[PDB]
């Protein structure tokens, strides 16, 4: 459904928020087949596994050469750097306490920094993530006894203090 917003339902994933964007993070072993969807990763690209996901924003693709072959290729507009698909315009962008993403406000594809919570781009530091600044959580955490929480530099819906994830139903329940 186009761009990821606070209303997006991450299929088999969950919303995380940084200083400049929101994205879906996948569960357990799953990988992003699109910006909203997570599915099982395939280990070997073959004639049988074509079109299937083999990594975040990476799919097994048929190469129509002589002979035909198969490879795990990043989606259009991305390139494999450090065994992860990143936008072509972020290839040589070092953001520091953050990650490089495509600036949605610039009609020409451009790389900008989205920062860990507590940081924002710093014009004095080549627009890196080294300026202390507040980012108010925009997530609508409406599930049972859940609230927005900063965890490892990202905002995420998690159990309120005093509650834990029930091991049967995967809902937040009182510790006991």
């Amino acid at each position: 459904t186009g761009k990821v917003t606070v209303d997006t339902v991450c299929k088999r994933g969950f919303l995380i928020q940084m200083s400049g964007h929101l994205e879906c993070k996948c569960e357990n072993d799953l990988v992003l087949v699109n910006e909203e969807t997570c599915e099982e990763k395939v280990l070997k690209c073959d004639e049988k596994t074509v079109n299937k996901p083999c990594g975040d924003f990476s799919k097994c693709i048929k190469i129509d050469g002589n002979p035909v072959s198969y490879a795990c290729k990043c989606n259009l507009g991305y390139d494999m750097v450090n065994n992860v698909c990143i936008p072509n315009e972020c290839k040589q962008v070092t953001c520091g306490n953050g990650k490089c993403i495509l600036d949605t406000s610039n009609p020409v594809k451009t790389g900008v920094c989205s920062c860990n919570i507590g940081k924002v781009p710093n014009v004095q530091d080549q627009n890196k993530c080294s300026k202390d600044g507040e980012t108010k959580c925009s997530l609508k955490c409406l599930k049972e006894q859940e609230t927005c929480k900063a965890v490892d530099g990202i905002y995420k819906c998690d159990c309120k203090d005093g509650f834990i994830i029930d091991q049967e139903s995967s809902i937040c329940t009182g510790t006991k």
Partner: single-chain antibody
Amino acid sequence: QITLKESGPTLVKPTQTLTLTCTFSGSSLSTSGVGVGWIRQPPGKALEWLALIYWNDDKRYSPSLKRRLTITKDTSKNQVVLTMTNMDPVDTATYYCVHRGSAPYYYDSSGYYSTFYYFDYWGQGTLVTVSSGGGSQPVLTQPPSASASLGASLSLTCTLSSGYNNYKVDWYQQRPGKGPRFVMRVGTGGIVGSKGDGIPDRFSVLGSGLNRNLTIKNIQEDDESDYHCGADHGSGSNLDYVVFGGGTKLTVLG
């Protein structure tokens, strides 16, 4: 667009070494590209692939000219350099710097997410004059010449040799006085991927068995040109070698 500018000496004396340089702009390290190479053409004759260097510093050379060829790259200066030893008058040719990139992703007949690698951008080339002083490979057969009237329709043919009925070929259009440009790739069915930039909708391709046809419809004056078909032999980015046909010269009557 990716611009390729050839530079180097244009007059060489026999037995000397030729050193051509190519300066590329619009690509850095696999930003919609996998390599940069060289293709030459003796005046009025068939294209001949020479060498290729990948961005992983891998190299490929023409099997028959390997002992004479060296290719290097200096990414800091956006340059690749070809070196050809023991030059001979028959080596008189226009030398084209070429970029090998990947076709925009497409869905084929069976709905299979697909792409391919091809020589998608060509430099204008430089004419090097040398003063006086291959088994079990595909063979591409093209008729030497063709002719058509203005507004007519025509099918140029490119036939594969036996045992190569699954191979896809690329068509290249070389308007006179200008260098080749990619037109379309065609295999056993219809168009493979999409047509090159600047290629008008009046062009289409259809293949069956060993035949690979390029059809030009509503033939205008600017279709008068040499039409070359080539075939890449290699699995993936890989490129063992490249075959070319003799080329067809299309004359537009009227």
